Scaffold this active site. Structure first.
Site, PDB file in Angstrom:
ATOM      1  N   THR A  19       0.807  -1.217   0.000  1.00 24.82           N
ATOM      2  CA  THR A  19       0.000   0.000   0.000  1.00 24.82           C
ATOM      3  C   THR A  19       0.845   1.275   0.000  1.00 24.82           C
ATOM      4  O   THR A  19       1.912   1.328   0.604  1.00 24.82           O
ATOM      5  CB  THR A  19      -0.937  -0.021   1.219  1.00 24.82           C
ATOM      6  OG1 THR A  19      -2.256  -0.378   0.794  1.00 24.82           O
ATOM      7  CG2 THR A  19      -0.974   1.322   1.925  1.00 24.82           C
ATOM      8  N   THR A  20       0.377   2.311  -0.679  1.00 21.52           N
ATOM      9  CA  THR A  20       1.146   3.551  -0.705  1.00 21.52           C
ATOM     10  C   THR A  20       0.841   4.472   0.489  1.00 21.52           C
ATOM     11  O   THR A  20      -0.320   4.705   0.850  1.00 21.52           O
ATOM     12  CB  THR A  20       1.075   4.266  -2.091  1.00 21.52           C
ATOM     13  OG1 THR A  20       1.042   5.690  -1.905  1.00 21.52           O
ATOM     14  CG2 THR A  20      -0.145   3.795  -2.900  1.00 21.52           C
TER      15      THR A  20
END
Ligand SMILES: Cc1ccccc1CNC(=O)[C@H](CCc1ccccc1)NC(=O)[C@@H](NC(=O)c1ccc(OCc2ccccc2)cc1)[C@@H](C)O
Lengths: 222, 120, 237, 235, 198, 196, 212, 233, 250
Positions: C24-25
Site C-alpha cells: 500500500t502507498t
C-alpha cells in the site's frame, strides 16, 4: 528495619449444617488503635459455590483470595468446565499456602460450601497450609473468645442429660439455618463487647444447593 | 550450544541415523546369550586385523555392572564404554536410595532409556 | 543476509525492498511547523468495519509512524521504537528528539542485515514529529538507510506520489501550512491509488503541528478529514 | 559425527586417514621396560633439533606418549591428560594407573564422535607406562575413542610394513636393549628418506632404573640417539 | 558425648562404636551400628550431627563401591582415606558443611598391614596406632598410651578395648548403651557380636 | 562540607569550602569540591567522597556520550542522570549532590539531589554539614536576579558563616561562575573572608 | 502430640492422639495424625502439622508412582528413605517433623522406620514420638512383651496414648488405633479421652492421682 | 530494606454526593528540618483521577513517572484512548496496589501511603488507600499519617456511614476538609500552612486548587497562659 | 542476533586434508617474505615494510612487535590477523604466567600459548583459521635464545634460521648456505639484510625494512634505575638510521 507484615484485626466464623454452610466475618479493618474502614468485606464468593475468607494480614489475605479465584478460573479452562469440589479446593489451597512455607501468608483461612453429597462443609487452614474439615471454626482476633462457645453450642460439649447423673451426653443434633444465624450474631455481639478489633458490621454468606445468599447486620461502632 | 537435529524421519517413516547404527552393530563382533535352568551364559569373539596384542590389559567384552548383573555388546567399543559407565552409576544410585540392588529388568530399562534419548 | 552479493549489494535486503514496493502507498509531508502522515487502506471486502483498522501509529506522544510492506514487520518496529522512546525519556527526562529517534530505528533495522540467522524488515517506514527545535520528517528503508525529507512516499504508487510531492516543493519554497498539507496528502493518496485501483480504498491521515496540535501526534477525524476527502475528490473530476 | 549408510563415522575415518600420513611412531614392550621411537616428518638442516619436541611427551613420571597426527591437537589432549593425572594423585595420594588415564583420554576423544558438531582430534597416541597393578603397559588410542593394549604397535605412516616386521622379530622374553634395536630396525625399513639419521628421530625408554627398585623415564638426547644408532650398525 | 574408638594391632584393626541414639530427653535406640563397609577390607565408623552422619557415610560407600566395580579392584585404605579427607575438606568451606567425624580402618592386602585413619569434619587426617572422636578421647588416649603395645594380637586388642569401654562406662556422664566391635584383617570384616554381656 | 549554588541574572554560581575530614583530622585542606560534568554543567558533592566521585565520573561519561549523539544536554537532563544513579542505588550510596548549569534557552538553573534520590529545582540550594548553620541567614538574604558581584558576596558571606560554625568546613572558598560570557573560577582566602 | 508404633508377634500396633495446638491455645481435638499411604503402609505425624501433612501426602504420590513404574508396592525401607532424603535436602530451613513409617511387605515383614527433620532415619521395634513421647514410653516399656495377644497389644498402645494425653498438656483429644498384619492395616477406632479416661480408670483401678 | 529520607505528611480525602475531595500540604520534610516548601503531592491522571501520596518523596517521584507513562502506554494503538478506553480510577489503583504488594514481597518497598480519589465513567465515586505493605481499604473518608488520627474523626462527623454520602454537598465537604487541614497544621509538627486540594466531580470533572493557605487561626488565648504550674507573672 | 554456526568450519575431507588450514597456508604464501636468524648471542627477525602509496606512513605499521621485554614476533600472511594475535599473546603472557609467577614466560611456553589460540580457531565453531604464520624470537634465562615458527594449524617448531611467505623457498636455501652455529649477532643482521634483498622489488632502505633483535639487556631502555637485578629489555627495534648504516657496508 522494614517489617513486611501487619495485622488488620477482624474475625471470621464458619459453620456447617446438613445441607448448607455459613461463613461470616466482621467488616471492620484496623491498624494498631485506628479504624481504616468500617465496611471492608473480607468474605468472598469465589465461584463454584465456594465462599472464602483469609483473615489476618489483609494484604496477604487479598493476594491469596485473588490467586484462588484465578485457580478456580484455570481449573475450568484446563478441565473442561468441571465443578471444583470443596475438598479439591481445600487441597489446592494447601498448595497455594505451602508454596510460601518460607515467606508465609499471614492469614487464617476458612472456606465453606457443600461436599459432593450435598452436605455443608467447612475447611480451615493455618498460615502454612495445614488443613482439616470441621463442623465449625472461628478465625482471627476473637477466635479464642468464640471457639469455646461453639464447642458448647454447636457440638454440645460438656452438656449432659439432666438426671442421667453424668452418664449420657446430650444428643448431637443438626442445626437449622435460622438456628445457626442466631449463634453467629450472638458470637459476634459477644466478641464486639470484649475485643477492641471487632465491631462495626457483620456480613454472613450462606451456601446451599440454590447458590450463595448474603446478609448484613450492624455491630457496635466503638 | 549446538543442537542441529541429526536423527530425523525419512518419507517412508524410517530414522536413518538409528538405521545406520544397526549397520554398525551388524559390523561388530558376535555376542550370544543363552539362559539355562539355574544359569545364564554369555559368549563373544575377537577379530583379526593384527595379532601382536597384549590381552592382560585389553577390555573384555563382558562387563560387570553390579556384582550380580553383566553387560555384553556388539558394535562400537567406544560407545559401549559410555553406556557401561552410566549403567554402573545408576546401579550404585539405586542401592543408595532403594536399599536394594537393581533388578536385571530395571537396569535394562535404564540402558535402553539412555539409548532412546540419544535418538531424539 | 549476512551475505554480500558480488556487486557489493545485499540480496536479502534487495528482496525486502520488493515486498515494500508491493505494498500500500503511504506518504509524509513536512510543513512549516509540523508533519502530516497519510496512507492508502485497501478495502478487501464490504465486511471491513470502516475506520476500525488503524494503520498509523504513535510513538511516545509526539512521533507519528506509517509504513508500507509487511504490516506485522512495521508493528514490530514501532514496538521497538516505543521502548527506545521510553528508555530515552527515563534516563534523560526530556522526550526524544526526532533525529535521535531516527537513528534508534536506523540502528535496529540495520542490525537485521548483519546476521544470516535474521531476515531484514519488509517495510519502509515514514515517521516524524515536532521536537525542541522544529518539525522533522524521515523515511527509513529495509537496509537501515534513512534521511530527512521535505516529502516522502513509499509503496505501489510511490513514483506518482513522489512526482506530486516534487511539484509542491518546487511551487512552495516559502513552506506549506499544516492545514494545507492535510488536504494535499489527501490529494496525493488519491492521485497514488491510480496504480492500485482494482480494489476500493479508505483514506487515513494524521498530523503533528506546533500550532494545530501543540506538538502532539493526533488523528485527523470528522470535519477536517471530510474536508480533505472533498478537496481530493474535487481535483479528480 | 554422523553415520554413513554402512555404519561408519565419516569424520573419524578421515581423521585416521589424516594420521596415516604422519611420521611413524612405534611402541615395543619388553620384560624389563618399554621403548618409544618416532620419526620426524621431512625436515631441514636448519630445523633446531636441540630444544625440539613434537612426537614424544611426558604425561607424569610413570607414563609417556608417542604422537601421530596434528601436533597442536595433541598438545590440547596432552595437557588435559597431565591434569587428569594430577587430580587423581591429589585425590588418592597414589599415581594414576596407566589404564585409567588412557580410558579418560579415549573418553574425551569419543565425545567428539557422538555430540557437539566439532571435528574429532587428528591424533593417535601410543602410551608407555608403568603401575604396580599391571607393570609395564603399552596402549594405543585413535580418533574413534578406541583403545587396545599391545606387545608392540605402530601408528602413523606405513603401519602395515611396520606391523609385519615387528610381528616377525618380536618375542615375549626380549630385554629393553633388543627392543630399542628392533625399534630402529623397523623404522629403518618402513623411513621415506635415504637413510635414518639421528636428527630425524625421537626416542624414550621406561626402565627399572638399574638399581633402586624404582621407575625411570629417559627421553634420549640428540647425542644419545646418535650413539644408539652407531652400535646397531646404522652409523 | 557418641563413642567412636579405633585400635590398630599387629595383624588387624579394631573399631568400637557406641550403640545409643539419643534425641533430647530419650534414648531412641540401644543397638545402632555406627559403621559402613566401604570395601571387603575397609570399614568406616562415624559420629557427629544427626542427619549428616549416615548420608555422608552412605555417599562415601556408594563412591567406593562404584570405583570397585569400575576397576574390578579394591582401593587401598590409604587411597580410601585420602578420598574421604578431600571430600570433607571441600565440605568445610561450602554453604552447609557435613559435621561428621570418622575413623577409617582397613587391611592393605598389598602391604599386608592394618591401617587406622582419624579424620575430623574439617578434613584433618592422621594415621594412628589408636584413635577416638569426641569426649571419649579425653579418657582413652592416656589409657592406651600406657597399656598399648605395637605387636599385640587381635585377642589382646580386644582386652585393651574392654578396658577402654569399662573406663568410659565409669567416668562419662551419658549412658551410651555399650559398643559394637568389628575387626578388619586379612580375611575382611567380622562382628564380635557378644561384647556387652561378655 | 559547605556547598551552595545560586542562580542570578546572568547565570549561576557554585561555591564550596575546601576541607575534607576523617574524624577530626583534616585529610585535605585545599580540596576542590566543584566538579565539572560538562562545559557548563557543574555540581557539588557531599556525603561519601568515594560515592560522589564515582557518580560524577559516570555522569561525565553519560553526558559525553550524550553530546556525541544528541548536541549539548540541558541542565535538567544532567540532573536526571544524577538522580537515576542516586535513586536506583540508594541503599549502597551516601550522596548529596547539587547540580548547576548554564543553558542558552533556560539561562541559570539549580537542582538539588538529597540522600534518597529525589530531585528539586530551586532558585538556590545549600547542602553539607555546614549548611544547617546558614539556613536562616541564606533565606533572609537571597534575592532573585542578583548581579554577579552581589551573588559572589552572598555566597562569600554565607559560606564564611558556615565555615565559622562547622568543624567539617574550612579552608578557602571556591566559586565557579557559569554564564554566556564562559566559565570563571574564583578563590577567596581566610584572611579575606574571616574579616566579614 | 503423642504418636507410637511397636512391633510384636501379631504384627504392628500404631496409636496416636488427636490434639493440635498453637502456643497454649488448643486448636483442635479431632485431628488425623495417621496418614494411609496404601493398604499396606502407614505414616504418623508429629511436629509442624503443615510440614508432616504436606510431605507425607507427597510421600503417597511418590509411592504410587513407584507402583506404576515397577509394578509392585514400595518397600517400607524405600518409602521411609524417600521422605528422609527429601527432608535432608531441606536441613537448616526450619522444617519440623518427627514421623514413623509403618508397614508390611513380603520381603521385609512388619517394619517400622523413625524419620525426623534432622535427617535421622532408624529401623526399630519400638518408637514414641511427640511432646508426650516420654509419657507413652513409660507405660509402653513397662508393659511391653513380644508375645502380647493382638487384643492385649491394641489395649497397650491405646493405654499408652491415654497416659500421655493425661499428663502432657499438648496431647489429648482421642486415640486413633491401627493394627498392621500381612493382610494390611486395620483401623481400630477413635476413642475420645473424655469417655476413655473414666472407663479405664474405673475398670483398671488406675489413675489414683485423680480427684474423685 | 531502606528508610524514608525526604518525606511528605498526611494526605486527606472524603467523598460527597457528586464526587471526591482530596487534599495534601506542600511540604517535604527532612527529619525535623522543614526543608522543601513547593512540593506537589497530588498527582492528577487524566481528568477523572487524582493520586495523593505521602511518605518518601523520591518514591513519590518514581510513582509520578510510572503514572505518566501509564497514560502514554494506554494511548498506544488506542483510538478510544480519550473515550471508552480512557484510564479509570479503578485501573490506576489496581496497578499501584499490584506494584506496592510486589515491592513489599521483594523486601524493597515504595515507602509511601497512597489514596486514589476519582470518579468512574459510570459516575461512581472512587476512593481507595494502598500503602507500602500492599494493604488496601476503602471508606467514605480516608487519611494517612496524622490525618488518620486527627482528620478522620472530624470528617466522619460529616460522613459516618455510606448513606451520608447523598446528603453531603461539595461546600460542606470542602469546608470539612479545609478545617481538618487547619487542625493538622495546629498539631502535626511535620505539617505546613500551604496546601493543594483537588475536587473530582461527576458534573463540574477535575478542579485542581493550588496554593491554598490555612486561615482563621486562633492564637490569642496564648497571651494569658504563663508558667507551667504556679508562676503568676 | 546470537551465533548460529556452532560447528567446525575446518573438517577432514576424504583424503585426510583439513582444507581450511591448507587454504590459510596458501594465504601465507602470498604474504610478504619474513625471516628469523639465530646467533650465539642474539636472534634477528626481519621483514619488508610493503607500502601501498608513499602517502602511507610505514613507521605507524608495526610488522615486528614486542610481545614481552625479551620476546618478539613478526609474520607473513594477513596483517589484521597478526595484530589481534599479538594483542591476545601479550595479554596471555600476563594472565597465564606473569600474574601467577611474577616473571615473564620463557619463549617455548608463550609460543605454546599462541599455538593454543591458533589451534582453537582450527576447531571451534563458527571460525576460520588464522591466515598467518609467525616467527617468534625470544630469550629466557634457562633456555637462552630461540626461534620458533607457528602455523595456522597451531603447529610450532624451532629453527636455527628460517623464512616464510612469498620468497620462502629461495630464502630458506640462501640461509642454509650461510648459517653456521658460530655467528655473532652483527653477522646475522648482515645475513638477514642480504637474504631480504632477494625477495624486494622496489626501494630497499631503512624505511622499507623493519628489523628487530633479541640481544643483550638495554638499561637505558628500562625507564628507571636503582634495582641492579634488572638491566632492561633484550628486545630492540633497529632504527631506520641503523639499518642504513649496515647497508652502505653491505
Ligand atoms: C504433626 C500434626 C499433624 C496434623 C495435625 C496436628 C499435628 C500436631 N502439631 C501441632 O499441633 C503443631 C504444634 C506446634 C508446632 C508448630 C510448628 C512446629 C512445631 C510445633 N501445631 C501446628 O502446626 C499449628 N500451626 C502453627 O502452630 C503455626 C504455623 C504457622 C504459623 O505461621 C506464623 C508465621 C507467619 C508469617 C511469618 C512468620 C511466622 C503460625 C502457627 C496448626 C495445628 O494450626
Amino acid at each position: 528495619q522494614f517489617n513486611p507484615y501487619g495485622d488488620n484485626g477482624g474475625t471470621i466464623l464458619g459453620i456447617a449444617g446438613e445441607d448448607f454452610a455459613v461463613l461470616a466475618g466482621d467488616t471492620r479493618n484496623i491498624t494498631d488503635y485506628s479504624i481504616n474502614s468500617r465496611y471492608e468485606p473480607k468474605v468472598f464468593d469465589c465461584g463454584d459455590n465456594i465462599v472464602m475468607s483469609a483473615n489476618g494480614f489483609a494484604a496477604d489475605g487479598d493476594a491469596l483470595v485473588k490467586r484462588f479465584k484465578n485457580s478456580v478460573k484455570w481449573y475450568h479452562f484446563d478441565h473442561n468446565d468441571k465443578k471444583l469440589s470443596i475438598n479439591s479446593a481445600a487441597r489446592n489451597i494447601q498448595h497455594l499456602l505451602y508454596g510460601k512455607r518460607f515467606f508465609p501468608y499471614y492469614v487464617h483461612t476458612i472456606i465453606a460450601g457443600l461436599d459432593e453429597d450435598g452436605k455443608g462443609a467447612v475447611y480451615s487452614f493455618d498460615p502454612v497450609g495445614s488443613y482439616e474439615r470441621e463442623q465449625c471454626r472461628a478465625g482471627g482476633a476473637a477466635a479464642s473468645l468464640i471457639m469455646p462457645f461453639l464447642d458448647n453450642q454447636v457440638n454440645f460439649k460438656n452438656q449432659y442429660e439432666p438426671g442421667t447423673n453424668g452418664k449420657v451426653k446430650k444428643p448431637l443434633k443438626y442445626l437449622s439455618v435460622e438456628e445457626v444465624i442466631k449463634l453467629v450474631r450472638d458470637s459476634f455481639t459477644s466478641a464486639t463487647e470484649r475485643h477492641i478489633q471487632v465491631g462495626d458490621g457483620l456480613e454472613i454468606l450462606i451456601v446451599t444447593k440454590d447458590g450463595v445468599r448474603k446478609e448484613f447486620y450492624e455491630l457496635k461502632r466503638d | 550450544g549446538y543442537d542441529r537435529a541429526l536423527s530425523i524421519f525419512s518419507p517412508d517413516g524410517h530414522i536413518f541415523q538409528v538405521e545406520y547404527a544397526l549397520e554398525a552393530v551388524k559390523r561388530g563382533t558376535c555376542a550370544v546369550g543363552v539362559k539355562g535352568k539355574n544359569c545364564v551364559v554369555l559368549g563373544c569373539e575377537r577379530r583379526s586385523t593384527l595379532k601382536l596384542q597384549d590381552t592382560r590389559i585389553t577390555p573384555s567384552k563382558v562387563s560387570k555392572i553390579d556384582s550380580h548383573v553383566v553387560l555384553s555388546f556388539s558394535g562400537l567399543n567406544a560407545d559401549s564404554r559410555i553406556l557401561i559407565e552410566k549403567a554402573r552409576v545408576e546401579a550404585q544410585s539405586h542401592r543408595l536410595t532403594l536399599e536394594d540392588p537393581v533388578t536385571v529388568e530395571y537396569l535394562t530399562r535404564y540402558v535402553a532409556g539412555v539409548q532412546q534419548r540419544y535418538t531424539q | 543476509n549476512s551475505v554480500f552479493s558480488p556487486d557489493g549489494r545485499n540480496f536479502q535486503v534487495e528482496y525486502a525492498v520488493k515486498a515494500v514496493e508491493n505494498g500500500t502507498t503511504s506518504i509524509g509531508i513536512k510543513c512549516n511547523d509540523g508533519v502530516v502522515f497519510a496512507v492508502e487502506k485497501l478495502i478487501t471486502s464490504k465486511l471491513l468495519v470502516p475506520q476500525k483498522n488503524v494503520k498509523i501509529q504513535v510513538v511516545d506522544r509526539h512521533i507519528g509512524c506509517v509504513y508500507s510492506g509487511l504490516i506485522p514487520d512495521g508493528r514490530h518496529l514501532v514496538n521497538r521504537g516505543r521502548e527506545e522512546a521510553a528508555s530515552f525519556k527515563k534516563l534523560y527526562k526530556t522526550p526524544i528528539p526526532i533525529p535521535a529517534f531516527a537513528d534508534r530505528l536506523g540502528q535496529y533495522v540495520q542490525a537485521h542485515t548483519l546476521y544470516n540467522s535474521v531476515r531484514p524488515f519488509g517495510v519502509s517506514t515514514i515517521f516524524g514529529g515536532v521536537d525542541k527545535n522544529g518539525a522533522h520528517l524521515y523515511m527509513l528503508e529495509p537496509s537501515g538507510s534513512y534521511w530527512g525529507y521535505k516529502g516522502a512516499a513509499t509503496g505501489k504508487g510511490r513514483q506518482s506520489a513522489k512526482a506530486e510531492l516534487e511539484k509542491l516543493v518546487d511551487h512552495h519554497p516559502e513552506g506549506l501550512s499544516a492545514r494545507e498539507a492535510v488536504k494535499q496528502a489527501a490529494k496525493i493518496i488519491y492521485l497514488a491509488h491510480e496504480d492500485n485501483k482494482e480494489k476500493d480504498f479508505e483514506l487515513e491521515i494524521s498530523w503533528c503541528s506546533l500550532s494545530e496540535t501543540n506538538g502532539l501526534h493526533k488523528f485527523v477525524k470528522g470535519d477536517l478529514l471530510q474536508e480533505a476527502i472533498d478537496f481530493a475528490q474535487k481535483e479528480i473530476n | 559425527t554422523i553415520f554413513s549408510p554402512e555404519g561408519r563415522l565419516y569424520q573419524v575415518e578421515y581423521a585416521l586417514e589424516s594420521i596415516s600420513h604422519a611420521g611413524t611412531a612405534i611402541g615395543i614392550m619388553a620384560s624389563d621396560g618399554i621403548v618409544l621411537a618416532a620419526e620426524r616428518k621431512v625436515t631441514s638442516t636448519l630445523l633446531e633439533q636441540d630444544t625440539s619436541t613434537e612426537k614424544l611427551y611426558k604425561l607424569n613420571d610413570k607414563i609417556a606418549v608417542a604422537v601421530a597426527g596434528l601436533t597442536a591437537d595433541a598438545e590440547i589432549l596432552i595437557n588435559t591428560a597431565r591434569i587428569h593425572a594430577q587430580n587423581y594423585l591429589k585425590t588418592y595420594n597414589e599415581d594414576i594407573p596407566v589404564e585409567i588415564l588412557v580410558r579418560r583420554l579415549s573418553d574425551i576423544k569419543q565425545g567428539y564422535t557422538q555430540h557437539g558438531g566439532l571435528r574429532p582430534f587428528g591424533v593417535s597416541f601410543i602410551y608407555a607406562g608403568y603401575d604396580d597393578r599391571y607393570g609395564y603397559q603399552l596402549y594405543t588410542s585413535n580418533p574413534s575413542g578406541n583403545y587396545t593394549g599391545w606387545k608392540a604397535i605402530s601408528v602413523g605412516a606405513n603401519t602395515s610394513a611396520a606391523q609385519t616386521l615387528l610381528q616377525m622379530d618380536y618375542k615375549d622374553d626380549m630385554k629393553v636393549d633388543d627392543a630399542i634395536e628392533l625399534a630402529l630396525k623397523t623404522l629403518s625399513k618402513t623411513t621415506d628418506s635415504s637413510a635414518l639419521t639421528y636428527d630425524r628421530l625421537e626416542f624414550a625408554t621406561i626402565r627399572k632404573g638399574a638399581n633402586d627398585g624404582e621407575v625411570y623415564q629417559k627421553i634420549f638426547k640428540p647425542q644419545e640417539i646418535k650413539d644408539i644408532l652407531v652400535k646397531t650398525g646404522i652409523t | 558425648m557418641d563413642i567412636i574408638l579405633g585400635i590398630r594391632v599387629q595383624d588387624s584393626v579394631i573399631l568400637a562404636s557406641s550403640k545409643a541414639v539419643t534425641r533430647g530427653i530419650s534414648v531412641l535406640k540401644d543397638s545402632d551400628d555406627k559403621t559402613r563397609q566401604l570395601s571387603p577390607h575397609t570399614l568406616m565408623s562415624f559420629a557427629g550431627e544427626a542427619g549428616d552422619t549416615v548420608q555422608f557415610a552412605e555417599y562415601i560407600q556408594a563412591n567406593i563401591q562404584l570405583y570397585s566395580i569400575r576397576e574390578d579392584y579394591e582401593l587401598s585404605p590409604q587411597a580410601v582415606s585420602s578420598f574421604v579427607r578431600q571430600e570433607l575438606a571441600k565440605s568445610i568451606r561450602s554453604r552447609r558443611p557435613y559435621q561428621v567425624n570418622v575413623l577409617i580402618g582397613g587391611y592393605d592386602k598389598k602391604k599386608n598391614k592394618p591401617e587406622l585413619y582419624q579424620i575430623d569434619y574439617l578434613g584433618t587426617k592422621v594415621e594412628l596406632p589408636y584413635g577416638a572422636h569426641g569426649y571419649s578421647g579425653f579418657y582413652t588416649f592416656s589409657l592406651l598410651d600406657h597399656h598399648y603395645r605395637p605387636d599385640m594380637t587381635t585377642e589382646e586388642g580386644l582386652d585393651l578395648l574392654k578396658l577402654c569401654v569399662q573406663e568410659l562406662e565409669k567416668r562419662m556422664p551419658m549412658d551410651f548403651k555399650g559398643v559394637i566391635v568389628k575387626i578388619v584383617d586379612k580375611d575382611g570384616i567380622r562382628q564380635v557380636d557378644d561384647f556387652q554381656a561378655q | 562540607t559547605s556547598i551552595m549554588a545560586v542562580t542570578f541574572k546572568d547565570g549561576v554560581i557554585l561555591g564550596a569550602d575546601s576541607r575534607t575530614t576523617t574524624g577530626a583530622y583534616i585529610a585535605n585542606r585545599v580540596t576542590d569540591k566543584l566538579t565539572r560534568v560538562h562545559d557548563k554543567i557543574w555540581c557539588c558533592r557531599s556525603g561519601s567522597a568515594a560515592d560522589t566521585q564515582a557518580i560524577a565520573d559516570i555522569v561525565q561519561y553519560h553526558l559525553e556520550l550524550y553530546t556525541s549523539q544528541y548536541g549539548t544536554p540541558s541542565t535538567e537532563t544532567a540532573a536526571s542522570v544524577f538522580k537515576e544513579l542516586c535513586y536506583e542505588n540508594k541503599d549502597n550510596l551516601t550522596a548529596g549532590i547539587i547540580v548547576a548549569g548554564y543553558d542558552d534557552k533556560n539561562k541559570g538553573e539549580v537542582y538539588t539531589i538529597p540522600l534518597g534520590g529525589s530531585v528539586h529545582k530551586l532558585p538556590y540550594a545549600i547542602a553539607g554539614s555546614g549548611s544547617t548553620f546558614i539556613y536562616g541567614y541564606c533565606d533572609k538574604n537571597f534575592r532573585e536576579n542578583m548581579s554577579k558581584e552581589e551573588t559572589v558576596d552572598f555566597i562569600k558571606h554565607s559560606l564564611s558563616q558556615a565555615i565559622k560554625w562547622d568543624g567539617s568546613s574550612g579552608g578557602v572558598i571556591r566559586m565557579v561562575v557559569l554564564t554566556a560570557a564562559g566559565v570563571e573560577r574564583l578563590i577567596f582566602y581566610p584572611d579575606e573572608y574571616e574579616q566579614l | 502430640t503423642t504418636t507410637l508404633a511397636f512391633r510384636f508377634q501379631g504384627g504392628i500396633i500404631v496409636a496416636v492422639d488427636s490434639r493440635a495446638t498453637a502456643g497454649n491455645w488448643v486448636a483442635s481435638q479431632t485431628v488425623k495424625k495417621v496418614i494411609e499411604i496404601n493398604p499396606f503402609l502407614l505414616g504418623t505425624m508429629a511436629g509442624g502439622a503443615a510440614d508432616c501433612q504436606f510431605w507425607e501426602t507427597w510421600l503417597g504420590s511418590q509411592c504410587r508412582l513407584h507402583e506404576l513404574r515397577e509394578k509392585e508396592r514400595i518397600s517400607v525401607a524405600a518409602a521411609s528413605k524417600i521422605l528422609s532424603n527429601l527432608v535432608y535436602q531441606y536441613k537448616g530451613a526450619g522444617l519440623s517433623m518427627g514421623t514413623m513409617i509403618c508397614g508390611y511387605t513380603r520381603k521385609e515383614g512388619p517394619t517400622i522406620y523413625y524419620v525426623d527433620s534432622d535427617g535421622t532415619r532408624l529401623k526399630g521395634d519400638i518408637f514414641c514420638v511427640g511432646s508426650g513421647q516420654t509419657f507413652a514410653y513409660g507405660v509402653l516399656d513397662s508393659n511391653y512383651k513380644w508375645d502380647l495377644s493382638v487384643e492385649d497389644a491394641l489395649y497397650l498402645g491405646k493405654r499408652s496414648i491415654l497416659a500421655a494425653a493425661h499428663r502432657d498438656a499438648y496431647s489429648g483429644g482421642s486415640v486413633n488405633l491401627y493394627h498392621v498384619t500381612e493382610d494390611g492395616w486395620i483401623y481400630h477406632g477413635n476413642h475420645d479421652v473424655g469417655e476413655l479416661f473414666w472407663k479405664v480408670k474405673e475398670e483398671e483401678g488406675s489413675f489414683n492421682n485423680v480427684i474423685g | 530494606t531502606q528508610q524514608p529520607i525526604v518525606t511528605g505528611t498526611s494526605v486527606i480525602s472524603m467523598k460527597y454526593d457528586n464526587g471526591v475531595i482530596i487534599a495534601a500540604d506542600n511540604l517535604g520534610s527532612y527529619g525535623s528540618l522543614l526543608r522543601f516548601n513547593g512540593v506537589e503531592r497530588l498527582i492528577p491522571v487524566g481528568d477523572n483521577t487524582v493520586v495523593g501520596i505521602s511518605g518518601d518523596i523520591s518514591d513519590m517521584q518514581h510513582i509520578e513517572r510510572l503514572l505518566k507513562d501509564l497514560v502514554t502506554e494506554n494511548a498506544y494503538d488506542n483510538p478510544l484512548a480519550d473515550a471508552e478506553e480512557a484510564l479509570e480510577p479503578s485501573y490506576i489503583f489496581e496497578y499501584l496496589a499490584t506494584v506496592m504488594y510486589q515491592r513489599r514481597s521483594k523486601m524493597n518497598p515504595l515507602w509511601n501511603a497512597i489514596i486514589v480519589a476519582g470518579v468512574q465513567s459510570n459516575g461512581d465515586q472512587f476512593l481507595r488507600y494502598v500503602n507500602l505493605l500492599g494493604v488496601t481499604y476503602s471508606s467514605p473518608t480516608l487519611a494517612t499519617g496524622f490525618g488518620a488520627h486527627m482528620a478522620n474523626p472530624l470528617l466522619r462527623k460529616v460522613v459516618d456511614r455510606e448513606s451520608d454520602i447523598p446528603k453531603t454537598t461539595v461546600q460542606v465537604a470542602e469546608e470539612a476538609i479545609v478545617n481538618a487541614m487547619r487542625v493538622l497544621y495546629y498539631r502535626d509538627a511535620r505539617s505546613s500552612r500551604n496546601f493543594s486540594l483537588a475536587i473530582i466531580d461527576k458534573n463540574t470533572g477535575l478542579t485542581f486548587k493550588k496554593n491554598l493557605q490555612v486561615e482563621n487561626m486562633k492564637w490569642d488565648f496564648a497571651k494569658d497562659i504563663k508558667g507551667y504550674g504556679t508562676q503568676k507573672i | 542476533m546470537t551465533d548460529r554456526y556452532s560447528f567446525s568450519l575446518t573438517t577432514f575431507s576424504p583424503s585426510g586434508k583439513l582444507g581450511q588450514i591448507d587454504y590459510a597456508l596458501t594465504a601465507v604464501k602470498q604474504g610478504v617474505t619474513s625471516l628469523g636468524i639465530k646467533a650465539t648471542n642474539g636472534v634477528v627477525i626481519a621483514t619488508e615494510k610493503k607500502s601501498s602509496s608513499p602517502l602511507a606512513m610505514s613507521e605507524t605499521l608495526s610488522k615486528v612487535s614486542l610481545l614481552t621485554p625479551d620476546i618478539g614476533a613478526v609474520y607473513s600472511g594477513m596483517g589484521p590477523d597478526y595484530r589481534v594475535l599479538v594483542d591476545k599473546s601479550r595479554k596471555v603472557a600476563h594472565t597465564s604466567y606473569k600474574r601467577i609467577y611474577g616473571e615473564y614466560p620463557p619463549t617455548k611456553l608463550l609460543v605454546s600459548e599462541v599455538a593454543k589460540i591458533m589451534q582453537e580457531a582450527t576447531q571451534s565453531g563458527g571460525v576460520r583459521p588464522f591466515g598467518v604464520s609467525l616467527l617468534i624470537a625470544g630469550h629466557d634465562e634457562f633456555n637462552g635464545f630461540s626461534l620458533y615458527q607457528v602455523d595456522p594449524s597451531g603447529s610450532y617448531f624451532p629453527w636455527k634460521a628460517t623464512a616464510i611467505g612469498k620468497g620462502s623457498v629461495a630464502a630458506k636455501t640462501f640461509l642454509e648456505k650461510r648459517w653456521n652455529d658460530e655467528l655473532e649477532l652483527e653477522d646475522a643482521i648482515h645475513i638477514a639484510l642480504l637474504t631480504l634483498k632477494e625477495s624486494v622489488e622496489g626501494e630497499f632502505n631503512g624505511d622499507t625494512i623493519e628489523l628487530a633483535i633479541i640481544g643483550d639487556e638495554n638499561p637505558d631502555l628500562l625507564g628507571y634505575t636503582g634495582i641492579p637485578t634488572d638491566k632492561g629489555p633484550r628486545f630492540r627495534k633497529l632504527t631506520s638510521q641503523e639499518i642504513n648504516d649496515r647497508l652502505e657496508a653491505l
